[PDB]
Amino acid sequence: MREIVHIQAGQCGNQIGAKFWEVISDEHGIDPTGTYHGDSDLQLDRISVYYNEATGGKYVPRAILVDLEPGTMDSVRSGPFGQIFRPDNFVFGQSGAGNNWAKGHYTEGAELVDSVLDVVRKEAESCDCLQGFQLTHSLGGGTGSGMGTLLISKIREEYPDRIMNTFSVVPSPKVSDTVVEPYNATLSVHQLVENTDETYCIDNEALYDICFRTLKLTTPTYGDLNHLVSATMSGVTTCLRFPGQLNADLRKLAVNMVPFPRLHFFMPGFAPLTSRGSQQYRALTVPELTQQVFDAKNMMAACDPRHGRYLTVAAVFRGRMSMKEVDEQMLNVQNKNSSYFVEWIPNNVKTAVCDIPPRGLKMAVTFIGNSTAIQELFKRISEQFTAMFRRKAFLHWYTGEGMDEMEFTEAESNMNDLVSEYQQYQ
Amino acid sequence: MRECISIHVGQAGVQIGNACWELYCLEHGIQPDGQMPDSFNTFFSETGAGKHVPRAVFVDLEPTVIDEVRTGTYRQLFHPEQLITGKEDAANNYARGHYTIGKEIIDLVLDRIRKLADQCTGLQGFLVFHSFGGGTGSGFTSLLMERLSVDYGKKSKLEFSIYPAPQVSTAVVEPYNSILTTHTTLEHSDCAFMVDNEAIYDICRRNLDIERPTYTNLNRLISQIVSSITASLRFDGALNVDLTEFQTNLVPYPRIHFPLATYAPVISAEKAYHEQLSVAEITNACFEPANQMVKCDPRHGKYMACCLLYRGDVVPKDVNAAIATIKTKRSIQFVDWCPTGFKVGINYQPPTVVPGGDLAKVQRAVCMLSNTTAIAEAWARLDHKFDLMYAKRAFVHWYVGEGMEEGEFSEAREDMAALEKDYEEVGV
Amino acid sequence: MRECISIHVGQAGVQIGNACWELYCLEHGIQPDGQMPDSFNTFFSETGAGKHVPRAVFVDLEPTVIDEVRTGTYRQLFHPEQLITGKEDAANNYARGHYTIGKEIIDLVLDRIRKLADQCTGLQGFLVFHSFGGGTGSGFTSLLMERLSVDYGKKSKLEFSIYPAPQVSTAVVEPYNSILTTHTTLEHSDCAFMVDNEAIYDICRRNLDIERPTYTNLNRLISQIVSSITASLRFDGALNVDLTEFQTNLVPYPRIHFPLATYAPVISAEKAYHEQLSVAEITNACFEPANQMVKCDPRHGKYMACCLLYRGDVVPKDVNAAIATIKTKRSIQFVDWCPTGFKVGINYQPPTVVPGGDLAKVQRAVCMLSNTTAIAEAWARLDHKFDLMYAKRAFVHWYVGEGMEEGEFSEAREDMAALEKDYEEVGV
Numbered sequence A: 001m002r003e004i005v006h007i008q009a010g011q012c013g014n015q016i017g018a019k020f021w022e023v024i025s026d027e028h029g030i031d032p033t034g035t036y037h038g039d040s041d042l043q044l045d046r047i048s049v050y051y052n053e054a055t056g057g058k059y060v061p062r063a064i065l066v067d068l069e070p071g072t073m074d075s076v077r078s079g080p081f082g083q084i085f086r087p088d089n090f091v092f093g094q095s096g097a098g099n100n101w102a103k104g105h106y107t108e109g110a111e112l113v114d115s116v117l118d119v120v121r122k123e124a125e126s127c128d129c130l131q132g133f134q135l136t137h138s139l140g141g142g143t144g145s146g147m148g149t150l151l152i153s154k155i156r157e158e159y160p161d162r163i164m165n166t167f168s169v170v171p172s173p174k175v176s177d178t179v180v181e182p183y184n185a186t187l188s189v190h191q192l193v194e195n196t197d198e199t200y201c202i203d204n205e206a207l208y209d210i211c212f213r214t215l216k217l218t219t220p221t222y223g224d225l226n227h228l229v230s231a232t233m234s235g236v237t238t239c240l241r242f243p244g245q246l247n248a249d250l251r252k253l254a255v256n257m258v259p260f261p262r263l264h265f266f267m268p269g270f271a272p273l274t275s276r277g278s279q280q281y282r283a284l285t286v287p288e289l290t291q292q293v294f295d296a297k298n299m300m301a302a303c304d305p306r307h308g309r310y311l312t313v314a315a316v317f318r319g320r321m322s323m324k325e326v327d328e329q330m331l332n333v334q335n336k337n338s339s340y341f342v343e344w345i346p347n348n349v350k351t352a353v354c355d356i357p358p359r360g361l362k363m364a365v366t367f368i369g370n371s372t373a374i375q376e377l378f379k380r381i382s383e384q385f386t387a388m389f390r391r392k393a394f395l396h397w398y399t400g401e402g403m404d405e406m407e408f409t410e411a412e413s414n415m416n417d418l419v420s421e422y423q424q425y426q
Numbered sequence B, C: 001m002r003e004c005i006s007i008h009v010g011q012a013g014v015q016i017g018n019a020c021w022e023l024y025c026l027e028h029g030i031q032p033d034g035q036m037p038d039s040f041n042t043f044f045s046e047t048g049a050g051k052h053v054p055r056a057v058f059v060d061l062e063p064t065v066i067d068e069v070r071t072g073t074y075r076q077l078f079h080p081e082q083l084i085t086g087k088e089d090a091a092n093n094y095a096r097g098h099y100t101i102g103k104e105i106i107d108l109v110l111d112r113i114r115k116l117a118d119q120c121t122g123l124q125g126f127l128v129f130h131s132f133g134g135g136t137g138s139g140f141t142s143l144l145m146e147r148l149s150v151d152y153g154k155k156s157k158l159e160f161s162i163y164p165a166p167q168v169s170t171a172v173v174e175p176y177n178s179i180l181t182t183h184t185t186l187e188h189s190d191c192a193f194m195v196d197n198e199a200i201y202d203i204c205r206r207n208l209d210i211e212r213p214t215y216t217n218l219n220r221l222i223s224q225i226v227s228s229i230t231a232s233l234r235f236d237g238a239l240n241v242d243l244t245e246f247q248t249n250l251v252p253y254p255r256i257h258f259p260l261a262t263y264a265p266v267i268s269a270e271k272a273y274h275e276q277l278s279v280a281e282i283t284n285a286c287f288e289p290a291n292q293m294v295k296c297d298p299r300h301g302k303y304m305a306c307c308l309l310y311r312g313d314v315v316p317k318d319v320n321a322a323i324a325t326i327k328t329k330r331s332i333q334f335v336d337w338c339p340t341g342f343k344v345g346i347n348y349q350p351p352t353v354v355p356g357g358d359l360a361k362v363q364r365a366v367c368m369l370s371n372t373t374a375i376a377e378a379w380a381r382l383d384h385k386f387d388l389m390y391a392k393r394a395f396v397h398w399y400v401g402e403g404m405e406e407g408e409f410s411e412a413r414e415d416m417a418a419l420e421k422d423y424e425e426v427g428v
Ligand SMILES: Nc1nc2c(ncn2[C@@H]2O[C@H](COP(=O)(O)CP(=O)(O)OP(=O)(O)O)[C@@H](O)[C@H]2O)c(=O)[nH]1
Pocket: A010, A011, A012, A013, A015, A097, A098, A099, A100, A138, A140, A141, A142, A143, A144, A145, A169, A171, A176, A177, A178, A204, A222, A223, A225, A226, A229
């Protein structure tokens, strides 16, 4: 009962999934072959939500892997828990986007999508009652953006009554991978406004910061980042997969943290984050967990949260905790920061508690916030777009796929409007 | 001969209920198996030869909270016909529970209720545990309540509701939920008792000396209170207070039927040795502002009526004295039209204590359910909270999506406002 | 039937009180556990079956001195409801105790007091131990005293205060503290007894033959004196002196209610064998300038009234003779308007002795509480001390910081000055 099939796209998204899946397997106790070796009985009662029980007791991941080139699918098979995945579910093309959303969304992706649109249906049929789809991709390039975007809107025609999650990675100003980020972002966001129910905007610039100072890691890699990001995902859907004193599923969360139709972009956060040095000396108790969580530099979105107010705020705690300890801390925080919470929505807090913790750690906190400080993330992008679009630069790649210069300004306008919605209520 | 049907709605109801059941089991000397190695006839029906099944119905829209009971120690006490389970949850929404999802499950349960209700002969009244702030506990309850007036009507109903706190509350959309669900409560429910978690927490901290409480400590506390209502039925004291009698006593008007509870003494195992528990002291404890179950102010309030229920080692000789003393005091005060305002109950049976319990084993115990103007002020701030939320159409679109028309909100707020003045009118 | 409520304020009060409690326990044959293997009903209430809890309230703004009791031998005698604890200390300041910090703690304690006070039926009067020079013992006491006149008023109060010495004093700002706290003492307190550490020290050295005394030796001494006040209540002698009676006797005017104590005999274990303790000798000992509890001069002073309280082996036949002899002597002298000036009490019960005690086990003992013009001269030098300190605004800024207005000082000094002349007026 209550199943969620997972979708993946892009070079980064796929990688994230690869780690995320592994982590989830570890949490339940699934091995590379698929046979169960775990001891705790409650891992097997909600195994059905993320694993179909196949023949011979070998569980399989309910997933769809998409790409416009075959390069990334090579390393996913050879790595750990690549053998658990079903051969049928891998989808891939021979062309590739080439860091262009125009090629990705119309010409290249629309030929590949019809295979996936048939594959997902089967998955849907398989489970008793599907409650929502998780989606993992990037907005920086053309492959993860153009394909995923194309897909997500066509799901709303067949399944209008289901919740829609999207785990994205938006561009940073300092750590700029590609040149045409402003373009891709500007166009890819447009469709994610009306079609999605919730979106987690992650940024690598913040991740790096988190890594250098807090974890004290001398040589970070993308692997670390993947591990981090996956943790957040694990956190949000913990209440479904395990019992608890106060359970909070996805729909509930959505209802609580999305007050208005067009303002649903969130910012993830994770705690506790401890190095080898801070593992010994940091006293892991609820208050400690709390304070760390609300720090500006501990966020995964590279902004200044204290420029504006949080519209809503929710948290998902794990491991056994006393509720007077838990529920008081939030209140205290609110009291402290009376200038950093919206006044006309009194009592902004939402809490959730799980009995089964992460293996090794005693407690954990996943922070999902909704703020007016997302303006800083978009504003810069808008500016960049303006700078680019003024001289019609890098345009012949997009215009070659049959896109008018008006069609840029149509999405641009929408983006602007969206941005304004935050500054309406700030 | 006498009988009563318990109902449990939402997660909260389920959670509360388990503890209560455990307490009941402890009381009558029944292990989880259901075979005892009379008084218990009310809540337990003896099936064939030595199988005690409870008068119970657990409703929930998730499987998680109900399957917690099916896998635990009390697997043997219930069977799948009693335990009803949905698919899609209420999702902390009134509109999801009442209109969309509520049509399918209620039908299943009504038949079940009938099957349980027609089996027993001496129906005293119903008990319905839920929360106002909860999704299932608001949307389904309202529906359920509406349904129950068709089949029965005059047969009595009670509900022990978890009232939301202004400070320590664990959900954002709670204001809305309360306002809507109180529309059905005024027409249908005969008398609803109200408890606030924040109030409980303070009590847990100060008196019990446990600075790390969780829901399991509150549940236990609640269960004792619940027992103290039904203790008059199941045991034969010198003087008795039935449910109908209680209703007659405590509830004066058609609009007002919202008394609040209190329980004393509640103290640690080490504190029991020093503290000489007298009757007068315990009486006082019920009237203290510190020991109240709701965030309220007895200093501003005036008690119209309040029903004391003693269990353990008590006799009427000093009870009278206690009563007199309270009357004499002017810190406690009543409304002009009610000269005599108490209803006094006694019981020989001592209140039991749970294995590994936070509460100490005591001789005496008290439970006062007071109807008052103190709780009238509690909704004035709720309304304010609600109003602000509504003023800019916050969280409204979700509700609209589930088939809630815009006039519903208008209906529920205005009514609430009207109600707030009623108390004032009565107390002038 | 009879009852009395003890209060302990500040560190000094706590420290004194423990010894007293111990003494009491010794008297009635009660180990620290609180179960005895009647007379004791006054100070101890029997909880349930064999648990004797004291009539007590310890106030302190630090945790250190109160947690000393909680960890020691008498952990079993008290429970955390009786023992109140602050956070920030008085810091040897009157202004910190009364205005800033005093609002929060007093509230907690008043309720507690009520709970204790309403439990007992025969309230004789209150006892309040503190020091004038102490921070908590001045600022809180004044507040507390003020509070207690609202709830009770006519019900009697006593306080055994540690008066500051002109020579041997262990704090710099003591002068200020005394002057302020005496403003509340004149209006509220019915009769306050005064003891000086320096005086005690001399006694300890000369008579007990222990040249290395610490507070524990003084505390014990004090406790005996305290007992000698309350010994008339708890035991049935041939003639009795209740607290009200004492008040009636010793205190003549509204302004003057400051008698001073004295205790005899106090001698070593080896000295008891040689020294034949006669009645006359012990009587004399109370009137000697060497054995007085305050730094004063009986040669300059005149006794208006003084209440003798004998316990042990005494009969009235030689008591009368003793009384006569003193009257006959002219070294001791009285005021013209009082021809008969004694109040004489007797008790059969001998005064007990503590395990490993400095005092010897004796048959007889005496305690004279004398109202006199000798103590009038004691504040003349205090005033001088105070005045100099004030003259250049020394230590004033701290006080100002805590919310003390400048006119307060003016009020307290002038009043004191006025009072000094009253004695003179009376004695002319
Ligand atoms: N957290 C991680 N972020 C990554 C990783 N690899 C890339 N990135 C970030 O994502 C951005 C690039 O995303 P993609 O390579 O998936 C662009 P896309 O696949 O949609 O198009 P093509 O690369 O043309 O196929 C870039 O700004 C990086 O900062 C990774 O392994 N982990």
